[PDB]
Structures are given as structure tokens and as C-alpha cells.
Amino acid sequence: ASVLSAATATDQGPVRENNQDACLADGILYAVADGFGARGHHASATALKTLSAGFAAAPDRDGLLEAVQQANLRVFELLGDEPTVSGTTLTAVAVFEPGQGGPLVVNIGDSPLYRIRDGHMEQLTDDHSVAGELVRMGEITRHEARWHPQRHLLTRALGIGPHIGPDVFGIDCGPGDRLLISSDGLFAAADEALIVDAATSPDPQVAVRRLVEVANDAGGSDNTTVVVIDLG
Ligand SMILES: C[As](C)(=O)[O-]
Ligand SMILES: [Mn+2]
Ligand SMILES: [Mn+2]
Ligand SMILES: [Mn+2]
């Protein structure tokens, strides 16, 4: 697997007063960060700026994991003394060559990574939210979790303490696969079938536009940000 094509889109949506999502798509590194709190936009932007500088200076598995740690520390040092809590999720994919261990995902919070293969979209990451933990534990299905009242309550977040333990795992993927990283806004309310239809648009630049349109037409209750990566 190498990168054939990639695209990104971010949209405030019609409801939220600002856009606190951020995204990154540079070389082999792709990421979404969904900020929260009064300065969530400062948190997501700061996390991705820190991730990208850290990875650029050490572009391997260890360098990536360390950049994630530095992003946590930088957002925390900047925002940690504010009267209220702001922080961010982070989901990052590094499309490493085989000599570097192949594609790797690092995730903290509820911004999912999906693999799209033969028209079928499968979530690869676990969601660190109250509902997401119930799914992980096998207590409820993803369908049953859809309208869980604590769906949006994070159980892990970047930038809120000196200590973060992200999930870090190798991606089962190869030539012809598509990866999608998104903030949770995409799945706020839209019909899953309409999402999959948009997510499978052959041109990734069309896919990201259609994904934002699907989320907004479904009500646009949240910011939506999407990164689409085609592998060859
Ligand atoms: C990660 As959020 C609580 O701003 O959707
Ligand atoms: Mn947010
Ligand atoms: Mn949310
Ligand atoms: Mn969100």
C-alpha cells in the first residue's frame, strides 16, 4: 500500500458558531482533530501543527508516537490553566512503507477511521466515548449505541492532562482500499447508506465534498471534517 490520491474537506455546518475541527494531509501523514470547549479550535489546530512538525523531524513509528505525546503536552501547556476545559480528539494515519512497518493508526477520542473495501465501509478504531466504551465491551452494538445519551462524552482526550494513552495499531489494508478519517460530525444524523454512497465516490475530491453535503443536508448539527486516502 502506497498513497495514490487523497483529499480533505472541513465544514462548519449551519448550526455551530465556529469550526473547532482541524485536519492534516501531508505526504504519508493524515489526521483529523475535533476540538472541544471554549478554545477547542486552538486545541485542534495546535495538536495538528505539533504532530506535523514532530513527524517531519522524525518520520517513523517512534517519531509519530512521540509527536502525539508532544501534541498533548503543547495543547495542555497552552490551555491547561484556563477557567474551563478545552481539548481535542486526534486520529492520525501514517502510510508507512513496509520497511517502516506498514500503515499505522494512532487514535484518541471519537474521530473514526474507516476502511472502504469492495463498497463496504468498516470502522477500524474504537471510540473513546461513554457509548463507544459500551460498544468496545460488547454491551451494545454500534446500531444500539446510535442514540445513546452519552454518545458525545469523551473518555480520553488530548491536551487536558500530562498523561494520554492513545490506541496505536497496524492497519489491515492494501492496494485498492480507501481510508476515511472523519470527525464525529459526519455521523451525527445522516442515513448510513447515504454516507457510504458519498464515501465511495471514485474521485476522492468528489467524495469529501459529497460527505460534507450529506452531513449538512442531514441537519449539520456539528462541524464535519473528512480525509479520504486511496491506496495503490
Ligand atoms: C470531540 As466533540 C465533543 O467537539 O464532537
Ligand atoms: Mn468539536
Ligand atoms: Mn461530538
Ligand atoms: Mn464533533
Q: Position of cell 454491551?
A: 139
Ligand 1 binding pocket includes 36 (Cβ within 6 Å)? yes
Residue nearest to atom 1 of ligand 1 (CA): 34
d(CA 155, CA 136): 12
Q: Cell numbers 453535503 label which residue?
A: 213
Atom of ligand 1 nearest to the CA of 185: 5
| Candidate from 110, 111, 224, 225 with most ligand 1 atoms within 8 A of CB, to mutate | 110
Q: Report the structure determination method.
A: X-ray
> Which ligand is closest to the CA of 224, given by its number?
4
DSSP strand pairing (104-108 vs 87-88): unpaired
Q: At what angle do helices 204-217 and 192-199 cross, to 10 degrees?
A: 160
Cell of 41: 479550535
Beta carbon of 34 within 6 Å of any ligand 1 atom: yes
Tell me the torsion sign for CA atoms 134, 21, 14, 8: negative
The label of the residue with cell 512503507 reads: 97
- Cell for 97? 512503507
Instruction: Find the domain containing 126 and state its range.
Output: 1-232
* C-alpha 54 – ligand 4 centre gap (Å): 25
CA-to-CA distance for 180 and 112, rounded, in angstroms? Answer: 8
Query: How many other C-beta atoms can be found within 10 angstroms of the C-beta atom of residue 84?
Result: 8
Please tell me whether 222 is known to bind a ligand.
Answer: yes
CA-closest candidate to residue 184, choices 2, 13, 5, 65: 13
Contact 167, 126 (CB under 8 A): yes
**Measured CA distances, 192 to 16, 169, 182, 218, 219 (Å):** 22, 26, 14, 11, 14
- Could you write out the three-class secondary structure of 60-104? CHHHHHHHHHHHHHHHHHHHCCCCCCCEECEEEEECCCHHHCCCE
Q: Is 152 in the pocket of ligand 1 (CB under 6 A)?
A: yes
From the list 4, 3, 6, the residue with the least C-alpha distance to 206 is 6
Domain CATH number, residue 37: 3.60.40.10
CA distance 61 to 117: 25
Residue 131 neighbours by CB under 8 Å, 6+ apart = 140, 145, 148, 150, 151, 153
- Tell me the resolution in Å: 1.5
Query: How many domains does the chain contain in total?
Result: 1
Calculated CA dihedral for residues 60, 61, 67, 70, nearest 10 degrees: -140
> Is the CB–ligand 1 distance for residue 184 below 6 Å?
yes
